[PDB]
Ligand binder design. Structure first.
Ligand SMILES: Cc1cc2nc3c(=O)[nH]c(=O)nc-3n(C[C@H](O)[C@H](O)[C@H](O)COP(=O)(O)O)c2cc1C
Ligand SMILES: Cc1cc2nc3c(=O)[nH]c(=O)nc-3n(C[C@H](O)[C@H](O)[C@H](O)COP(=O)(O)O)c2cc1C
Ligand SMILES: [Fe+3]
Ligand SMILES: [Fe+3]
Ligand SMILES: [Fe+3]
Ligand SMILES: [Fe+3]
Ligand SMILES: [O]
Ligand SMILES: [O]
Lengths: 400, 400
C-alpha cells in the first residue's frame, strides 16, 4: 500500500494490461487504475473497492494492511463493477459491516450483488460521519455524474476529496501523485475521459461544482477512483472541467468517413485542402473510422467547432460503422456544433441525405451536403475543394 | 495460364492474402480470385480483367500468352474495381480495341477510369458477336445483379456461361474446377457470398434465371469471376440460387448482442435454453457482435427463421455495433423473418424499445420485447428462459 496523506492509505489496484472498457467502446491505450482508500483514525474506513477481476488480490492485500474485523465503515461512492466489483468477496468475510451510500446505490449494489441483507446506510448531501481525532466524513450527492448513485466523500482536517470517477482518468503509473507523472499523457487521458463519458452531463457539471465550492471546504488533495491523486495545485482539474462543460470547442474541424474504394476518401482530402487555404486558423483532423481509434475521433469532435462526415451508398443505406458512430454521438449529445454530410454513390444514392438527417437528430446544426458520382475527376475535386471553402467561411469564428 | 476448355484460357489472378472486401464490411477468410478469360478462335476475345492491385502482373502475364495487338475484342460484364481495375493499364497499350458492355457500364467504366474516348459498344440481351469457327458470344443483361451495369456472356459451341459475380464465391485454390476442391469450404463460401451480397436482389434472381433457361442454351461450364469454374454438374449452383432467392429460411434462430458487463449476455444464454427445451427441432446460434465475425452472423440470419437482438442502454441509446448491424440488415432487406429485442438497463432504459423499432424498420415481424434491470437474478433468469419458450412456440414451423 501507499501513504496518500497522514493516515490515508492507498489500497487499490493498478491495471497495466486493460484495453477494453464498457465492452469494447472505450479503449484504454495506457491502462488504468482502480483506487481504493483506507482511512485509519479512531474509526477505520474503507472507501470503494476494485474491479471484480482483482477481488482475491484486493482482499489479501487488505488483510496485510489491516485486520478485516477492525474495519468499521465501508463507503461506496459508486457501484459500477470497476469500483464495487470486489464487494461480495469482502462482505463474505465481514457481513455485519455497515455500508454508507446513496439511496440510488442500494438499488445498484443489490442489482449487481443480490445481497439486500447487507447493512445499508442512506446518506444525502450534508450528512456527516465522525471517525475520531477531530475528523469527519462529509457526503455530497452527485446524481447522473455519471450515474444516479454517484456521490463524493470529503474528509475534514486532511482536506481530501474522494470524488470517485469525477476528475479521474484512465492512466496507469507506479507513481501515485499528479506531479510525479508525464503531464502531456495525463492531460490527454483526462480530456479523453470527459469527452467520451461526461459530455452528455455537462449541464449538470457546472451547477454541481458551484454547489461544492459554496460549501467553502478546503481541498488539499483530490483522490479519484481512476489514475493519479491531485496534490499539486489540485483544483486545476476542476477548472478544466468547468471549461469543458461549457459546450467546449476550439477553432478545429474533424473529418471522418468510411469507404470501400477510396472515392469518399478523395472527397475528404479535397475538402480539407479547401478549408486550410481559406482559414489558416483552423486545425483539421481526418480519420477513417474503420482504420482509426473510435475514442480518439470522439475526443476530436468534442474539441471541434464542427464536423464533416462521409459515407458511400451501400444497399441504399449508409456504411454501418458510420451509422454506429452517429448513434453514439446521439447519446453523447454534443452542443453548439455544426455538421456537413458528404460521400460518393453509384446510381441513385441516398445515404448522404440519410446521414445528414441522423446528424441533425444528433444535435448538429446542418449545412449543405456534398455529393459525387463514382470516382471524382479533376472537375469534381474542384467542387469538393470549393465545398471546404464554403464550410470554412460559414463556420468562421471571426471575419476573414 | 490454365486451359478451361478447348481454346478458352484462364488469365486471372489468385489472391491468397486478401481479407477485406467492400472496405472492411466483407471478410474473405479464405482469400479470393479474380477470373479473367482469353478466348482464341478466329477472333481473340478477352473477358474481364482483374483488381487494379495486380494490374502490372495481369498485363505481363497476358503478354506471355498473346501479343496484345492480336486481341480483337474486350468484354466487360461488370465494371467494379475487382474486375475492371486493370483496364486503364491495358488500354494504355491498345487504345483502339473495342469494348463490349451494357449502356450502364459506359457510365461506370468512365466513372472509374475517366477515359470516355475509348471505343465502347453497347450490347443488350440477345445481341451476338461472332468470333469464327462457327462460334459466337451471346450477351444477357442482368441489371441490379448486383449492379446496374451487370451482364453475362454466353459462348456457343463450347457452351460456357461467363456469369461474372453471379454463382461465384470468394475461395482461393490452385485448382480451377469445382470437382477439384473441398466441397464443404466451397458451399460455405457460396452461401456466405449470396447472403451478404445478393439477398436484397432476390426478387430479381428468379425471373432472370427463368429468362436465361428460356433461351434453351446448353451449359457445359459456368465460368464466374470469383472462385472455381463449375464443370461437374454446373447447374447445382443455379439450383442453390433458386432456393436461396425464395426468402430462404431453415428451422434456425440466431441470437446476437453487445454487452458491457455481461448482463445482456446472461439474458441471451437463458433465452437459448428456453428455446432448446421447448423445440428440439430448432438450431440455435449465439454471437457477441464485438467478438464475432460480422459476415458469419449475417449468413446465419439469412439461414434463420427469426432472430433475437440484445443491447444494453448506454446514454439512452443502443450499443453502436448493434446500431451499425441493424443499419446493414436494413439494406440486405431480409424477408419473411421474425425478431425480438432484449437487453439490460440501469434506470430509465429505452434502448430495447429503440432497437425493436429499428428492427421493424429493417423488415422483421416483431414479437414482444424482454427487459431486465442490472444483473438478472434467479427469478429474472426464469423470465428470460420463459421468453425463449414463448418465442419457440410462436415461431414454430409445425405444431408441438
Ligand atoms: C456492395 C455495394 C453496394 C452498393 N450499393 C449502392 C447503392 O445502393 N446506391 C448507389 O448509388 N451506389 C451503390 N454502390 C456503388 C458505390 O456507392 C460507388 O461505387 C461509390 O462511388 C463508392 O464509394 P466509396 O469508394 O467511397 O466507398 C454500391 C457498391 C457496392 C460495392
Ligand atoms: C457508460 C454507461 C452509460 C449508461 N447509460 C444508461 C442509460 O442511459 N440508461 C440506463 O437505464 N442505464 C444506463 N447504464 C447502465 C447499464 O445499462 C446497466 O449497467 C446494464 O445492466 C448493463 O448492461 P450490460 O452488462 O449487458 O452491458 C449505463 C451504463 C454505463 C456504463
Ligand atoms: Fe463509473
Ligand atoms: Fe470507474
Ligand atoms: Fe461486383
Ligand atoms: Fe466481384
Ligand atoms: O466506474
Ligand atoms: O465485383
Amino acid at each position: 500500500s501507499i501513504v496518500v496523506k497522514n493516515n490515508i492509505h492507498w489500497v487499490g489496484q493498478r491495471d497495466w494490461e486493460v484495453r477494453d472498457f464498457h465492452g469494447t467502446e472505450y479503449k484504454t491505450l495506457r491502462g488504468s487504475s482502480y483506487n481504493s482508500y483506507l482511512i485509519r483514525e479512531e474509526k477505520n474506513v474503507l472507501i470503494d473497492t476494485v474491479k471484480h477481476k482483482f477481488s482475491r488480490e484486493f482482499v489479501q492485500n487488505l488483510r496485510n494492511e489491516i485486520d478485516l474485523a477492525d474495519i468499521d465503515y465501508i463507503v461506496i461512492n459508486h457501484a459500477e463493477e470497476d469500483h464495487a466489483g470486489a464487494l461480495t468477496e469482502l462482505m463474505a468475510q465481514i457481513p455485519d459491516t455497515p455500508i454508507y451510500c446513496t439511496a440510488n446505490a442500494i438499488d445498484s449494489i443489490n442489482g449487481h450483488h443480490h445481497h439486500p441483507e447487507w447493512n445499508f446506510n442512506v446518506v444525502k448531501t450534508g450528512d456527516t460521519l465522525d471517525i475520531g481525532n477531530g475528523k469527519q466524513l462529509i457526503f455530497v450527492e452527485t446524481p447522473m455524474l455519471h450515474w444516479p448513485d454517484s456521490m463524493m466523500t470529503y474528509l475534514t482536517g486532511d482536506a481530501v476529496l474522494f470524488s470517485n470517477d469525477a476528475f479521474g482518468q484512465h492512466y496507469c503509473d507506479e507513481h501515485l501523485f499528479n506531479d510525479e507523472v508525464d503531464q502531456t499523457e495525463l492531460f490527454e487521458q483526462c480530456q479523453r475521459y470527459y469527452a467520451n463519458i461526461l459530455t452528455p452531463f455537462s449541464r449538470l457539471v457546472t451547477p454541481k461544482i458551484t454547489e461544492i465550492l459554496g460549501f467553502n471546504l478546503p481541498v488539499d488533495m483530490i483522490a479519484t477512483s481512476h489514475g493519479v491523486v491531485w496534490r499539486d495545485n489540485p483544483t486545476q482539474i476542476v477548472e478544466l472541467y468547468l471549461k469543458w462543460a461549457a459546450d467546449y470547442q476550439e477553432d478545429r474541424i474533424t473529418i471522418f468517413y468510411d469507404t470501400m474504394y477510396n472515392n469518399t476518401r478523395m472527397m475528404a482530402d479535397a475538402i480539407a485542402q479547401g478549408i486550410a487555404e481559406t482559414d489558416p486558423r483552423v486545425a483539421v483532423k481526418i480519420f477513417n473510422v474503420a482504420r482509426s481509434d473510435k475514442n480518439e475521433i470522439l475526443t476530436n469532435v468534442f474539441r471541434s467547432k464542427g464536423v464533416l462526415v462521409g459515407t458511400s451508398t451501400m444497399n441504399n443505406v449508409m456504411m454501418p460503422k458510420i451509422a454506429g458512430l452517429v448513434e453514439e454521438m446521439t447519446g453523447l449529445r454534443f452542443r453548439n456544433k455544426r455538421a456537413s454530410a458528404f460521400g460518393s454513390h453509384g446510381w441513385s444514392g441516398g445515404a448522404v441525405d440519410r446521414l445528414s438527417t441522423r446528424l441533425q437528430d444528433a444535435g448538429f446544426e446542418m449545412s449543405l451536403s456534398l455529393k459525387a458520382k463514382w470516382r471524382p475527376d479533376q472537375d469534381a475535386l474542384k467542387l469538393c475543394r470549393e465545398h471546404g471553402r464554403e464550410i470554412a467561411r460559414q463556420w468562421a469564428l471571426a471575419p476573414l
